[PDB]
């Protein structure tokens, strides 16, 4: 019977439109009887759709406020207030933007040097280190073509061990062909956070970023 005012995603906050806040109410018993109220009525189009996707014999109501990113980047505290008929005190919860926001530090690491003599594929790595809100968005580019999200594997954003503040980390790997690397294409990781001016840090690597033997024979 709990209440969660889940924040917008980071996708539509950078590119798209429907920056919807998701006030989910999970674990109520009978059938219905909900009432959802919010504080900034700026396009209030109340949808609920109470599904069976609830994991128990107690349903959910996933309320949505649509079209709000202009109030979100400002920082007005959005407050979701749900009246459910099994009590009279409403489930009230609030959330806003985060206070400390550090910015990512993209590092596009090259292929490891033993992968190139196998001639199968090569492995580009994109570490993104030290951001203070948790949400991040990694994209990859070849030339200037955005690659679709089933060609690269992206791990989660976990907390790193720090004796500074609460900072995080992300890794994304792209295995690309050996001939496309060996010819000399340019591959770019693009890490997007809400704590950047241009909202997309981008790094780029190609094949081009000394043996010197001396035979002292006899």
């Amino acid at each position: 019977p709990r209440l969660s005012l889940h924040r917008p995603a980071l996708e539509d906050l950078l590119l798209g439109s429907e920056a919807n806040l998701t006030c989910t109410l999970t674990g109520l018993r009978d059938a219905s009887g909900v009432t959802f109220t919010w504080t900034p009525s700026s396009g209030k189009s109340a949808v609920q759709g109470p599904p069976e996707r609830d994991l128990c014999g107690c349903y959910s109501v996933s309320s949505v406020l649509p079209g709000c990113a202009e109030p979100w980047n400002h920082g007005k505290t959005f407050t979701c207030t749900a009246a459910y008929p099994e009590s009279k005190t409403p489930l009230t919860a609030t959330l806003s933007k985060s206070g400390n926001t550090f910015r990512p530090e993209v590092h596009l690491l090259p292929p490891p040097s033993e992968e190139l003599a196998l001639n199968e594929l090569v492995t580009l790595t994109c570490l993104a280190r030290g951001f203070s809100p948790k949400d991040v968005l990694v994209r990859w580019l070849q030339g200037s073509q955005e690659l679709p999200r089933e060609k690269y594997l992206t791990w989660a954003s976990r907390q790193e061990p720090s004796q500074g503040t609460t900072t995080f980390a992300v890794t994304s790997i792209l295995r690309v062909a050996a001939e496309d690397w060996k010819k000399g294409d340019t591959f770019s990781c693009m890490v997007g956070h809400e704590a950047l001016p241009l909202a997309f840090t981008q790094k780029t690597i190609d094949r081009l970023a000394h043996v010197n033997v001396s035979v002292v024979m006899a």
Partner: protein, 513 residues
């Protein structure tokens, strides 16, 4: 030389499939390392197209797999749904793509009344016509260089390249050379076309070790089953250095190693070569011609040999020497993975085709004229067994073969030579006893054998067993004592030395009550 081996040359047509087997030494490194199938493009760079670590290239996605058989000691690559861009040069191999351990395959697919016959056999050509040609000139014509030149014309006239060969509905032509693969036209005033395609038969791939043995099973037809078969090798050019022949030839280097087995009820025989060297790897064409040589028109059958020098077969003494009166104790190896078998021993007699009749086997049958002078120990176990043969004369000088009754072929040969000297262990000749009272026999032995273990064994047909026996250590003498001689204490006795398991010189005396 890289120890990998597979097909030098593959062919197909479009839409087809191939399966390419590459053979490697089955040590414990080769069977767990990655196997690749790369493509040898120009400028340098063999790009991996499939691998044994999961990687399947986008070109070969959904239409190839690489499956690895370690026990056989090979791996195979199945390529489906071919096309004319799947031609060119490839490599199979083990490991990193640039560091050797590879075989260069050259796969050339091609574009797809077709008479496909094998070399040397005979062809039926069905020539129908129109029945306004009842009694005309029922013939063939060949288009040599795109020009209709006569072959056989309805009355016995045959061009003398084809004499004694072709006869006259359908026609039939025997003994197909490679100069019979043109575009024939039957003709009775109308013409019919049919193209002959004589096929060279493909080599099998024999992958043997160094100092090993190879069995060539030459199953030609039963309609050629009366003709004098042969086993050519193929030179760098065009000829034949015939190894064995059924007409009483044998190659002068294959003395003692070769064996042509007798035929079957349907022709299929086998040749067994042992002790393979580095110059034995080549192309071997077994065929059947009355001349005893590869002429033209004989139905060949070819193998392609590879003598792997990374050989698991241990370097044994290939010549043993014993004096005229002495003993030899040869060690014959076998495969450690199969212990319990019957184990043989031959004397290679040439002079008919190269037979090899058994002297002794392990289950206890010793030949008739080798009673008391031959024994087959199973010592030391795990991949060896001793064969002791004493009382040597110069009628024992020859080659002897260490066979097994196992699914593996370590069928080694070893030559025994008779050098001038005298034996070490010195026993009396053929002593006698008197019933009841005792018998003592002396066996001298020189200073070399003074650390060894001595015995006396009563030779049964199933092998010795060491017996009473004293061993005086100051005076070099080991002595038998048969205390109250009965009837069941007779037959041969052997006084030889040993070292734990590795038996040595033995000398024989027979007792007569």
């Amino acid at each position: 030389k890289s120890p990998i081996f597979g097909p030098e040359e593959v062919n197909s047509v479009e839409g087809n499939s191939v399966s390419i087997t590459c053979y490697y030494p089955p040590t414990s490194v080769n069977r767990h390392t990655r196997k690749y199938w790369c493509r040898q493009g120009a400028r340098g760079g063999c790009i991996t197209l499939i691998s044994s670590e999961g990687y399947v290239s986008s070109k070969y996605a959904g239409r190839a797999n690489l499956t690895n058989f370690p026990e056989n000691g090979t791996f195979v690559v199945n390529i489906a749904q071919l096309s004319q861009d799947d031609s060119g040069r490839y490599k199979c191999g083990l490991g990193i793509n640039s560091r050797g351990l590879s075989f260069d395959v050259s796969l050339e697919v091609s574009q797809g009344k077709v008479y496909t016959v094998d070399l040397g056999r005979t062809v039926t050509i069905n020539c129908p016509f129109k029945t306004e040609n009842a009694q005309k000139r029922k013939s063939l014509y060949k288009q040599i260089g795109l020009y209709p030149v006569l072959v056989i014309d309805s009355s016995g006239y045959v061009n003398p390249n084809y004499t004694g060969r072709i006869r006259l509905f359908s026609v039939v032509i025997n003994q197909l050379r490679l100069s019979d693969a043109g575009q024939y036209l039957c003709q009775a005033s109308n013409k019919k076309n049919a193209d002959l395609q004589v096929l060279k038969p493909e080599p099998e791939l024999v992958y043997e070790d160094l100092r090993g043995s190879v069995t060539f099973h030459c199953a030609l037809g039963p309609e050629v089953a009366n003709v004098a078969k042969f086993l050519c090798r193929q030179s760098s050019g065009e000829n034949c250095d015939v190894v064995v022949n059924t007409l009483g030839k044998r190659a002068p280097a294959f003395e003692g190693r070769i064996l042509l087995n007798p035929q079957d009820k349907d022709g299929s025989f086998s040749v067994v070569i042992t002790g393979l060297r580095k110059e034995d790897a080549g192309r071997y064409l077994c065929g059947a011609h009355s001349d005893g040589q590869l002429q033209e028109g004989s139905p060949i059958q070819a193998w392609q040999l590879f003598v792997n020098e990374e050989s698991t077969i241990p370097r044994s003494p290939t010549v043993v020497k014993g004096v005229a009166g002495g003993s030899v104790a040869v060690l014959c190896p076998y495969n450690r993975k199969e212990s319990k078998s019957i184990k043989y021993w031959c004397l290679w007699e040439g002079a008919q085709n190269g037979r090899c009749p058994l002297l002794v086997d392990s289950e206890g049958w010793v030949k008739a004229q080798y009673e008391g002078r031959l024994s087959l120990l199973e010592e030391p176990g795990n991949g060896t067994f001793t064969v002791i043969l004493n009382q040597l004369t110069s009628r024992d000088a020859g080659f002897y073969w260490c066979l097994t009754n196992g699914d593996t072929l370590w069928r080694t040969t070893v030559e025994i030579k008779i050098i001038e000297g005298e034996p070490n262990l010195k026993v009396p000749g053929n002593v006698t006893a008197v019933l009841g009272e005792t018998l003592k026999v002396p066996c001298h032995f020189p200073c070399k054998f003074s650390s060894y273990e001595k015995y006396w064994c009563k030779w049964n047909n199933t092998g010795c067993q060491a017996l009473f026996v004293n061993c005086d250590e100051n005076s070099r003498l080991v002595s038998l004592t048969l205390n109250l001689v009965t009837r069941a204490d007779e037959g041969w006795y052997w006084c030889g030395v040993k070292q734990g398991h590795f038996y040595g010189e033995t000398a024989a005396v027979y007792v007569a009550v």
